[PDB]
Amino acid sequence: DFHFSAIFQPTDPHHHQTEFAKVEGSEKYVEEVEVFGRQALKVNPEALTILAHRAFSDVHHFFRKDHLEGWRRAIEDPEASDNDRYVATTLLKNACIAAGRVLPSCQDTGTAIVLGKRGELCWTGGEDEKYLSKGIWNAYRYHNLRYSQTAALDMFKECNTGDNLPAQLDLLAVPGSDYEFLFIAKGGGSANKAYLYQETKALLNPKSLRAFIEEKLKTLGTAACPPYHIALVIGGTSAEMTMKTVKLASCRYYDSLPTTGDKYGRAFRDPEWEKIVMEVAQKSGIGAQFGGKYFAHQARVIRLPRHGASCPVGLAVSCSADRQILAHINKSGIYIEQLEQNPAQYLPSVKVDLKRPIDKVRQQLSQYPVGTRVMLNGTLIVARDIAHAKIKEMMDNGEPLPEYMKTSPIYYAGPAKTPEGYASGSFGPTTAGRMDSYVDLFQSHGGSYITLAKGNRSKQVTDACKKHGGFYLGSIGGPAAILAKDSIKQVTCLAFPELGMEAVWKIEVEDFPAFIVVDDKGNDMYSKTLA
C-alpha cells in the first residue's frame, strides 16, 4: 500500500531545455571511474572555483532571453504606456552597456547564492564550500562589482566584510555521479520583496484567492525595479520550504513541473492562475515603475501540499537585475548556461539646474505636478541606510544636521567599484522606503528637502514634504551602468569612508533623468495605483 511520490517531479530535471557552453579544456578536472560496480566521477575541487568565478562574473553582464523579450514586449505593445516604453528602452540600453563586460548591469551586484546538487558518487574531496567561496571571492575581487555583505560584530555593531562573502551555499545530496548547480546573484531590493503569509482553508476558493492576489501584488509596489518576474506559492510543508520554492519559481527553475495534482500531493504549476496573476498585474495600472501595463514580465504559480491545519503562502519577484545561471559538471567537464551576448537585437522633460541655492531648486520644482519628467544637472549628495542612522544618532546627541545634508538633493545609492580609467562604477538608486523614518526629522531640522531614489514611499513622507516644502524624485530603477557611463562625471567620498559603498558621497551629474513622485502639496503619483 506504500507508494513513494516525490513532491517535485520536473519533466526536465537536468534542464535540457537550457543551452550550455563547455569551459575549454575543463575535461582535465574530471575523471570517470568505476567503483564496486558503479560509475563514479572524480572532480578536482579547483573546478568548483573556476565555475563559480565564471558564473558570478558572466551573470552581471548578460541576461536570459525571456527577460530581454519582456522588455521588447513592453516597447512594442500598443497598449503599453509612454512611461512603460521609456523605462523598458532605458533598461535595454543599460543591458547593452553591461554586455561590454566592464560595468555590471546593476550597482547592487547582489548576494552570492549557490544551489548545488552533488551526486552520491560525485567525489570532490569534500571541501566544496571553501572552493566555491574562493571562486565567488575571485569574481567580486577582480571585477568591477560591489562588496554588499554586512557582518554583525555584535547585535548592533556592523562592518562591511569587504569581499562580498559569506555566500549562501545550499549543497544537496542527490542520486548519480554528476554535480548540478543554480547560481543566483540576488539583489537586496528584490530579496526584500519575498513575503510569507500564514493563511487558511478560507483562502482556498476562486473569489478569496483572486482578491488576495489583487491585495498582495500592490504591496510589492515599484520598490524592486519592475517589470517583475512574479512567483506565487500556495501551500508547502513548512514556511522555509514555501519560501525556498517561491525563490526557485522566480528563477524559472520549476518551469517543467507537471500542471496537475494527484492523490499523493505532488507539486504542480498552475497555468490558469499564472494567467490570472498576469491579468491582475496588467489591470493594476502600476506599470513598469511609473504607471502603465507592464508591472510584470511573466508569472509562475506553484501549488504545494499542506498540513490540514496550515496554509503557508509565498510571494516573491525577480527584478530588472534578473541574474541566475544554470551549470553542471560531468565526465566531459564544466558546462555553464549560455546567456544572451547580443542584447541590442531586442531593441527596435524639464531641465533642473542643481547649481543654485537649494531653495531656488525647491521653487522651480514647486511649479510642476507629480509625474513630471525632470533632467538633473549638478551636485548630488549620496547617502543611504547606515549614514542616515549615524546622522540621526548625531542629532540625538545634540549635534547639528551636517551641512552636506542641506546643500543638495540626497541621492540614496551605493556605488560598485570604479573601472580603471572610468569616472564611476555602476551607480543606480537604492529603495527610498527604507529611509522614510528619517525624512520628517531631517526636514524639520532644515535638510533633505529633496530626495532622489526609486520606489513608492509611505504617507509620512508625503505629509513631511507637504509640511516642509519638500520633494521626492524617482530615478528609473535598474539602469546603473548607463547612468554611470552617461550621467555621472565625478565621484568623491565625503564622509564615513569605513562604510565602503555606504559612505556619504558627493557626485556631479549631467542629464540625470527622474520623475517628480511626491511634491510639496500633498500629492503622490502612486496614490491611485498603489492605494
Q: For ligand SF4, which residue of 187, 287, 292, 425 counts as binding (CB under 6 A)?
A: 187
Q: Is 303 among the residues that bind a second copy (CB under 8 A)?
A: yes
Residue 240 to residue 312: CA distance in whole angstroms: 9
Q: For ligand SF4, which residue of 58, 84, 108, 128 counts as binding (CB under 6 A)?
A: 108
Residue partners of 189: CB distance under 8 A and separation at least 6: 108, 223, 224, 225, 319, 430, 431, 477
Q: For a second copy, which residue of 16, 142, 159, 211 counts as binding (CB under 8 A)?
A: 159
Indicate left, alpha or beta for 411 from its phi (over 0: left) and psi (-120 to 50: alpha).
beta
Selected range binding ligand SF4 among 122-130, 233-241, 292-300, 316-324, rule: CB under 6 A: 316-324
**8 Å CB contact between 456 and 477:** no
Interaction mask 43-72, ligand SF4, x per CB under 6 A: ------------------------------
Torsion sign over Cα 203, 208, 212, 215 = negative
**Residue for cell digits 483572486?**
210
**8 Å CB contact between 143 and 133:** no
CB of 273 to ligand SF4, least distance (A): 25
Q: Is 127 among the residues that bind a second copy (CB under 8 A)?
A: yes
Q: Is 531 among the residues that bind a second copy (CB under 8 A)?
A: no
* HSE of 112, CA atoms in CB hemisphere, 13 A: 28
**8 Å CB contact between 409 and 376:** yes
Q: Is there a binding annotation on residue 126?
A: no
Selected range binding a second copy among 260-268, 348-356, 369-377, 490-498, rule: CB under 8 A: 260-268
Buried b (16+ CB within 10 A) or exposed e, 99-121: beebbbbbbbbbbbbbbbbbbeb
Q: For ligand SF4, which residue of 312, 415, 447, 478 counts as binding (CB under 6 A)?
A: 478
Of 138 and 408, nearer to a second copy (C-beta) is 138
Q: For a second copy, which residue of 431, 443, 451, 529 counts as binding (CB under 8 A)?
A: 431
Q: Is there a binding annotation on residue 275?
A: no
Q: Is there a binding annotation on residue 319?
A: yes
Residue partners of 459: CB distance under 8 A and separation at least 6: none
Q: For a second copy, which residue of 13, 17, 142, 264 counts as binding (CB under 8 A)?
A: 264
Of 208 and 364, nearer to a second copy (C-beta) is 208
* HSE of 207, CA atoms in CB hemisphere, 13 A: 1
User: Cell numbers at residue 181, please?
Assistant: 548547480
Q: Is there a binding annotation on residue 363?
A: no
Q: Is 437 among the residues that bind a second copy (CB under 8 A)?
A: yes
Q: For a second copy, which residue of 12, 16, 142, 151 counts as binding (CB under 8 A)?
A: 151
Amino acid at 88: A
Of 322 and 519, nearer to a second copy (C-beta) is 322
Q: For ligand SF4, which residue of 276, 321, 387, 517 counts as binding (CB under 6 A)?
A: 321
Taking residue 199's Cβ as centre, other Cβ atoms within 10 Å add up to 17
Buried b (16+ CB within 10 A) or exposed e, 371-385: bbebbbebbbbbbbb
Q: Is 296 among the residues that bind ligand SF4 (CB under 6 A)?
A: no
Name 311's bridge partners.
199
Q: Is 167 among the residues that bind a second copy (CB under 8 A)?
A: yes
Q: Is there a binding annotation on residue 454?
A: yes
Among positions 218-237, residues that touch a second copy (CB under 8 A) are: 234-235, 237
3-state secondary structure of 171: strand
Residue partners of 34: CB distance under 8 A and separation at least 6: 40
Among positions 204-243, residues that touch ligand SF4 (CB under 6 A) are: 224-225
Selected range binding ligand SF4 among 158-166, 318-326, 370-378, 490-498, rule: CB under 6 A: 318-326
**8 Å CB contact between 101 and 64:** no
CB of 55 to a second copy, least distance (A): 17
In 3D space, the residue among 417, 326, 335, 341 whose CA is nearest the CA of residue 139 turns out to be 417
Selected range binding a second copy among 12-20, 77-85, 119-127, 481-489, rule: CB under 8 A: 119-127
DSSP 4-39: ---S---S-TT-TTS-EEEPTTGGGGEEEEEETTEE
State how far the alpha carbon of 11 is from the alpha carbons of 158, 173, 222, 229, 273, in Å.
45, 20, 34, 22, 20
CB of 20 to ligand SF4, least distance (A): 25
Residue 477's binding partner among a second copy, ligand SF4, none (Cβ under 5 to 8 angstroms by kind) is: ligand SF4
In 3D space, the residue among 6, 117, 203, 159 whose CA is nearest the CA of residue 502 turns out to be 159
In 3D space, the residue among 378, 382, 351 whose CA is nearest the CA of residue 364 turns out to be 351
CB of 110 to ligand SF4, least distance (A): 6
Residue 489's binding partner among a second copy, ligand SF4, none (Cβ under 5 to 8 angstroms by kind) is: none
Q: For a second copy, which residue of 216, 218, 244, 445 counts as binding (CB under 8 A)?
A: 244
Q: Is there a binding annotation on residue 189?
A: yes
Residue 215 to residue 403: CA distance in whole angstroms: 42
User: Cell numbers at residue 324, please?
Assistant: 541566475
CB of 508 to a second copy, least distance (A): 24
Residue 106's binding partner among a second copy, ligand SF4, none (Cβ under 5 to 8 angstroms by kind) is: ligand SF4
Q: For ligand SF4, which residue of 45, 116, 119, 189 counts as binding (CB under 6 A)?
A: 189
Q: Is there a binding annotation on residue 462?
A: no
Residue 201's binding partner among a second copy, ligand SF4, none (Cβ under 5 to 8 angstroms by kind) is: a second copy
Residues making up the binding site for [4Fe-4S] cluster:
106, 225, 319
Residues making up the binding site:
106-108, 146, 189, 192-198, 225, 319, 384, 430-434, 454
Residues making up the binding site for (S)-malate:
107-108, 146, 189, 192-198, 384, 430-434, 454
Q: Which residues bind ligand SF4 (CB under 6 A)?
A: 106, 108, 187-190, 224-225, 319-321, 428, 477-478
